[PDB]
Amino acid sequence: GLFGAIAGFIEGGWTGMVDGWYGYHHQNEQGSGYAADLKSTQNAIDEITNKVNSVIEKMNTQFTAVGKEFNHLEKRIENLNKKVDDGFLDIWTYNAELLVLLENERTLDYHDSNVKNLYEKVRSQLKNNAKEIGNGCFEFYHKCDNTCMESVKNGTYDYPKY
Amino acid sequence: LFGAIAGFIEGGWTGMVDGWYGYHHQNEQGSGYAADLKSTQNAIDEITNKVNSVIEKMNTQFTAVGKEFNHLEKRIENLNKKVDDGFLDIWTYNAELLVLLENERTLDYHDSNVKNLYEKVRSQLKNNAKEIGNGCFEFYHKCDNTCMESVKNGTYDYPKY
Amino acid sequence: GLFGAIAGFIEGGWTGMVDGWYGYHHQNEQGSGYAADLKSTQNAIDEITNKVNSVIEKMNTQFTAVGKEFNHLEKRIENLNKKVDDGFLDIWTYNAELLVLLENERTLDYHDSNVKNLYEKVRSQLKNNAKEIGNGCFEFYHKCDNTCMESVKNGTYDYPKY
Amino acid sequence: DTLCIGYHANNSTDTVDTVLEKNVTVTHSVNLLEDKHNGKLCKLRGVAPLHLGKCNIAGWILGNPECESLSTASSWSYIVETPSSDNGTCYPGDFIDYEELREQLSSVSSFERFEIFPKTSSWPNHDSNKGVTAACPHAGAKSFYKNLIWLVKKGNSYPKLSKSYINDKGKEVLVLWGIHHPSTSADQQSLYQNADTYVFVGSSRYSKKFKPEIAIRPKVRDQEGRMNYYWTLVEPGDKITFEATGNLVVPRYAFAMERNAGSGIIISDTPVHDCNTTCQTPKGAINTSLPFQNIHPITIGKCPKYVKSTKLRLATGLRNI
Amino acid sequence: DTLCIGYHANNSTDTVDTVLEKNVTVTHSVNLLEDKHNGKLCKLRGVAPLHLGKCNIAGWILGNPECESLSTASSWSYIVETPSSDNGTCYPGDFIDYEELREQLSSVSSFERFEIFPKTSSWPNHDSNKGVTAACPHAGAKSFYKNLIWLVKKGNSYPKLSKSYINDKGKEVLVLWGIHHPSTSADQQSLYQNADTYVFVGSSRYSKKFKPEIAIRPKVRDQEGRMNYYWTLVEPGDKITFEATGNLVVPRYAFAMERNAGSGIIISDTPVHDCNTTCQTPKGAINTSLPFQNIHPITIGKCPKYVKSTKLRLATGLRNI
Amino acid sequence: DTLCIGYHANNSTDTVDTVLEKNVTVTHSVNLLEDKHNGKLCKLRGVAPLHLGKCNIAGWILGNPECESLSTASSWSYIVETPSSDNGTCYPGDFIDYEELREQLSSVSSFERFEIFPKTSSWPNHDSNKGVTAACPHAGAKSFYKNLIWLVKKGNSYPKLSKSYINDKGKEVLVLWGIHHPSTSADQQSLYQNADTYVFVGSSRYSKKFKPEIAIRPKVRDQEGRMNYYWTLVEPGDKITFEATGNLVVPRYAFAMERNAGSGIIISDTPVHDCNTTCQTPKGAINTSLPFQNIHPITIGKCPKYVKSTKLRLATGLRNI
Ligand SMILES: *[C@@H]1O[C@H](CO)[C@@H](O[C@@H]2O[C@H](CO)[C@@H](O)[C@H](O)[C@H]2NC(C)=O)[C@H](O)[C@H]1NC(C)=O
Numbered sequence A, C: 001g002l003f004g005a006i007a008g009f010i011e012g013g014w015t016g017m018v019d020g021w022y023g024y025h026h027q028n029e030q031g032s033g034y035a036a037d038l039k040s041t042q043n044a045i046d047e048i049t050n051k052v053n054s055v056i057e058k059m060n061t062q063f064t065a066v067g068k069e070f071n072h073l074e075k076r077i078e079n080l081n082k083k084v085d086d087g088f089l090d091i092w093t094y095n096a097e098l099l100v101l102l103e104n105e106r107t108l109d110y111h112d113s114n115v116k117n118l119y120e121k122v123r124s125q126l127k128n129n130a131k132e133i134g135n136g137c138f139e140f141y142h143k144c145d146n147t148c149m150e151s152v153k154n155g156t157y158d159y160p161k162y
Numbered sequence B: 001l002f003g004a005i006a007g008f009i010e011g012g013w014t015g016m017v018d019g020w021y022g023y024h025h026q027n028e029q030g031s032g033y034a035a036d037l038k039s040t041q042n043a044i045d046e047i048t049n050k051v052n053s054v055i056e057k058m059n060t061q062f063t064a065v066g067k068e069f070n071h072l073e074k075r076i077e078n079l080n081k082k083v084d085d086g087f088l089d090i091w092t093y094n095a096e097l098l099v100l101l102e103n104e105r106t107l108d109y110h111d112s113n114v115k116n117l118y119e120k121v122r123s124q125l126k127n128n129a130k131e132i133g134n135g136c137f138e139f140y141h142k143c144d145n146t147c148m149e150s151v152k153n154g155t156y157d158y159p160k161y
Numbered sequence D, E, F: 001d002t003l004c005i006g007y008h009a010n011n012s013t014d015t016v017d018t019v020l021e022k023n024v025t026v027t028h029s030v031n032l033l034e035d036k037h038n039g040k041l042c043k044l045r046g047v048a049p050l051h052l053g054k055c056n057i058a059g060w061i062l063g064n065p066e067c068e069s070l071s072t073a074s075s076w077s078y079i080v081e082t083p084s085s086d087n088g089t090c091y092p093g094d095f096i097d098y099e100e101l102r103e104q105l106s107s108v109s110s111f112e113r114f115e116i117f118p119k120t121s122s123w124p125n126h127d128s129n130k131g132v133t134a135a136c137p138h139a140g141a142k143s144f145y146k147n148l149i150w151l152v153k154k155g156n157s158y159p160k161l162s163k164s165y166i167n168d169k170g171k172e173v174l175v176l177w178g179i180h181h182p183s184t185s186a187d188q189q190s191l192y193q194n195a196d197t198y199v200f201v202g203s204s205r206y207s208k209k210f211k212p213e214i215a216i217r218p219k220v221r222d223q224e225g226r227m228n229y230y231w232t233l234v235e236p237g238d239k240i241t242f243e244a245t246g247n248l249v250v251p252r253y254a255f256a257m258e259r260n261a262g263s264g265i266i267i268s269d270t271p272v273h274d275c276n277t278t279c280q281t282p283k284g285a286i287n288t289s290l291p292f293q294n295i296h297p298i299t300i301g302k303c304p305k306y307v308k309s310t311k312l313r314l315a316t317g318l319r320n321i
């Protein structure tokens, strides 16, 4: 919803496609088929993984034993100690709560970007040779066989065609 | 960040007062500012949730800061002061940056919403109009009130030249 | 990589251009030349600078002397003190580590945005008078001299041609 | 015929800051920073605070003649002293573990003050009427603490005294007493005939034997003697025993008390009013939902984090033009 | 012919939250919050904890007849008491700097208990056999601490005693002793004939001299008298000297010790098992790599930060339709 | 014909990290982490520190014969000891509330050392020349603390002494004294005839009666006896009274002092130099504007937050290629 792609001009998702996060659904004479973009899906997985392994792996703690013992004549420093424990409780709770809210918003925008970026990367390939429906789908102006699609999803798409 | 607000659409419309994003049609029937209800309504719902997150996630304990020490407890008095100043610098900094970041993002959110609106109509009437470049389109055919209605409605489903 | 421009549909960068971050390379009869977009580069520099001067200048600390002294019969409050020092150590280390990871991601996306935004700002100036190669490069459909390019990079580009 | 797309703008001048740009004008914005208090000292839980007015904690529990018009309240959320309140221990001395006591007294759930050792029937072998001083004046004439009794010898005789109270209350009992240290060995016998005395206080957990320290201290409120104050908490069903051959300022009133830990003490001139608040500061109360405040670092209750910031405006709308 | 570009979707119902939107369903997500423990008290470094079972720290080092089970353990990572361990100082009294000891004793790297002053050959001038009490029962019959000896007079004679131990261990030596305060001057001489006695303990750093405080305390475990407990650490090569004319409960067993500071004490009923853990809580151990946990604030080891959150679900996939 | 659009690149190899990519080369970058210090102990406000060199705080204020060469600076920002300063309390004993004094003394705005009780004219009924010891040698000759005087009896007579100083300075006066505890009752009378003595120190706030504890302690610096050190602050206009029948080590020099709280003490081998710094560590000073540093956790002044990070490289430019 930040790049207009996911849940935007491309309303729903394909329960059919199960090879990756982003892909295509071709429809020629040879037949219909869902095919996930390997390279793109493979890159996101590598980056999102690194993201999770950053939020986790950057938390390196010390070896300490929280909790101390005080007698009935040390209620003050007992409360001081409690203040230190509650201070650290509010700081980590808040920071962890917001860190997730923010990085969730960003992660969803990351996928939105990746989809839109995929759109555009194909749309400019084949400018005239097809028209934009508006639903993330293109309608070819010429016979596009399996090895024709294969050159679009491949990034190696000839224009000596019409 | 998206090139829309303060970008290829320089200024804003003091005229429009029913939402954050909208249109200004100019046909024979007349001119008028009309805010996009759905879009404006969605942003308001999301920005509200944003503020109610930064606020509502701050759940504190019931504690009484401040303690008393005699002239022979200056050390633990300074320890206590050190805990108070540590929490002071942590919250001040985090609050200062949290606002700087979420302000940057919020303005980009509105920029996105505008640009997204520009594209959402630009791709509905491809040929039937031309892009001036100022966020404005010039129709190639008579567009009456019920014609505009179908553009701002998302149901402009019949191509007519 | 978030806006598809840098390391996207514009693969590499120009070691040639040395006047700014963002620019152009014109190729007419008068000759070839790298020319950095002054206004755009100047604006980013002003904003990125402000960014660094925010992360730094917002850290205003107090005049305190960490570290305290305890005897052999104050091991508890010595450990309490140690707990306060280690708590502040983990909090600052983690947030500083994450603050950099996030603002790094964002900064690179900022430059990506600025490039893409520049591509679009020119591509909508001269719609028909040139065609999109797809490599961030345009091929004019008419003679574009030095004072023709000037009007494109200037934002003052008239449209009475074919 | 044209169709343009744009955004909102208004007469707003609210500015906010971003990582990239400072003083960016905006259509709409909220404040995250609370900077407004009612300048009142309000109730905290649903219970009002204990205001000592002219006196401080010491003078209040000991019963200093000036704090005469003070405590009845059976419970309070926190305690309020005025920076001007100087009426405490009128007879010079050392209040042992004073700060600690204040902290235990900061908030209580039930607090009734009963006469532990009835003056009339408790001391038939000692004089319980000569025990006054010019240091504790009540209307120009000599007085003493209401909650303590300064037992002296009954005409040339100070017999070993031995009283004891057993806590039959359903809660802790705060018991206060005092040890008097005369300035000269002449005043020692003049007060308690015996020249070598001792006092002993003991319970199930407490035990301590006091020996007077006779010497000339510099004059404080005209006394070159001293008087140290002591206190303890007796658990329900437990007993506390007093035993002394002189120098013992005995308990007259004790306090049945139940203490809900986790409060504090406010030293402020701010007037106490009838209002509810979830967060209290010396400067006044804070009625806010915001995450941050810059009113006062010393806070009581469930409060916003204290921050040094002068403004924390959070943008909600978009750039204004 | 066509092509249409799109994204993945599945039967997943995992929801996450964002700054902008709540309960957003997604394809894939991980949890940052650990909320699961094995409900076991495990080893910590590689060394198991010290479980006191029926007794607490006091009863354990003093040698209370009930803690007369084991614990020979020469080292432990932390100490475990049960909330329902009440066997400590059977003879009413005050354990001076008790909490501090416990912290010193929380974790130890070597801990052998040797007989410092051999009972048979150390006290030829005092009775080391009458020193028992009904307060320290072992099998209905009177007993006493196993690491302390209650010396009394040998028939009408309590000669000044004067023993001293020199630390020839390659480590600190924890030495515990006691000072007995009889209830009446009759019991004073009946135990140590002298009526005015004194005890003195001294080392290179310690020096204190105690005076018995004879008085009637309220009955605790049927004793009107009291017994205060003291302890100290003797450096290697240093010596500690005991000297007394009565009232001294002498050391029988000491402890050669070496303490790796930085641990604590867990009061829990949770069973102790044979398992490795890097983080321990009263509830159980935590085997996690996650940055946060909401199991227990009191933690021991290298643990995740404790957080109030109920769930911290981080989205990895995308919006799911 | 044509017009290409692109970005910058150079010979830079600076790498940075992002949430999604590690070790990304980029055109430009700054460092947020300071990791460089000048290895010098510098001034801190504008005032240099107090360097004790061979001695420690105790030896410095008491006047240990070795700290003979250091006491003049009328103010300092913080205090520096060396890990190899061992010259403190040469006569074995206990420095009560020592570390606390050190805190009070950490930073001072004005500090002049005046002779409170002039040796010649103050002690007219006692010997002020016989008070030396082999424990405090000066020139192989027995000596003692410069700021204290060890009053002994004048040939078979130790009359009750009673002197008192009234603070006429315009600031607090630190007063130090000592109580001597002889090893044997033979040395007791040999030093102060009377066999049962007592010392009393008292002011408006302070009051304490000391009783000598005579016994044989293990020999420390060849002393079987002990000497405890005490200190107090006397308010302006207030007076302090000394009284004793023996065993009192009296004040000779006091200190007019005004303390600006909020500093500390550095124990380091790092040389002290004439330089300005806003932040000090024991390893050296830090001249930085960066928000973070990884030099040392113990810091003094207005310093960057201590962080465990080993590099905090903040990208400013763009990808290289
Ligand atoms: C209650 O407080 C007042 C004010 O502090 C005390 O009055 C002072 O008494 C001293 C000693 O006589 C005088 O030197 C001051 O000038 C007085 N100050 C004022 C403002 O009157 C009074 O002694 C206290 N009363 C009791 C019973 O403690």
Ligand SMILES: *[C@@H]1O[C@H](CO)[C@@H](O)[C@H](O)[C@H]1NC(C)=O
Pocket (backbone or CB within 6 Å): E064, E065, E066, E085, E086, E087, E088, E089, E090, E135, E136, E137
């Ligand atoms: C052990 O504990 C029980 C109850 O906790 C108590 O009754 C018993 O006297 C104790 N035994 C000793 C020797 O302290």
Ligand SMILES: *[C@@H]1O[C@H](CO)[C@@H](O)[C@H](O)[C@H]1NC(C)=O
Pocket (backbone or CB within 6 Å): F010, F011
């Ligand atoms: C390349 O590096 C050299 C020195 O390493 C430096 O002087 C020069 O400025 C660099 N080139 C550019 C374009 O910055």
Ligand SMILES: *[C@@H]1O[C@H](CO)[C@@H](O)[C@H](O)[C@H]1NC(C)=O
Pocket (backbone or CB within 6 Å): F017, F022, F023
């Ligand atoms: C990569 O960067 C990481 C930090 O993210 C660093 O620890 C490592 O040494 C670097 N090595 C390589 C090969 O990138």
Ligand SMILES: *[C@@H]1O[C@H](CO)[C@@H](O)[C@H](O)[C@H]1NC(C)=O
Pocket (backbone or CB within 6 Å): F043, F046, F047, F274, F275, F276
């Ligand atoms: C350091 O600051 C002091 C301020 O008292 C000033 O007198 C001195 O000139 C400064 N020295 C240096 C080297 O900056």
Ligand SMILES: *[C@@H]1O[C@H](CO)[C@@H](O)[C@H](O)[C@H]1NC(C)=O
Pocket (backbone or CB within 6 Å): F054, F064, F065, F066, F085, F086, F087, F088, F090, F135, F136, F137
């Ligand atoms: C410290 O001073 C004493 C004399 O007071 C001297 O005998 C001793 O050698 C000194 N020790 C050190 C480590 O300088």
